[PDB]
Amino acid sequence: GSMQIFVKTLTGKTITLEVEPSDTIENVKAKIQDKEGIPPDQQRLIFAGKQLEDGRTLSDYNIQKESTLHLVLRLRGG
């Protein structure tokens, strides 16, 4: 079931995560918070030229095995 994905920063390191296609974008941000200490409200996740909405799943966005997403950091905006 599960699979690994990567989350790249703009100019730093890359994060490796273990996920399932049924995982929501909100879950993935939780997993980053677990591995890096970044709250989800400070995280924009990007894939294929757009930011990803929290309540949608990876399979929803056609995110597959070994895909690389991008993490752009932010302050909490409302």
């Binding site: 790249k8 703009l10 100019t11 894939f47 294929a48 030229g49 690389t68 991008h70 752009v72």
Partner: peptide
């Protein structure tokens, strides 16, 4: 070309991973 260069930050990306490069350049806009 073997590699691409980000036109904004000068990071180098292998040309074979084109979605990842394009996403990187997109993320500058954000």
């Amino acid at each position: 070309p073997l590699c691409f260069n980000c036109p904004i930050c000068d990071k180098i990306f292998p040309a074979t991973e084109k979605q990842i490069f394009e996403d990187h350049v997109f993320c500058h806009s954000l």
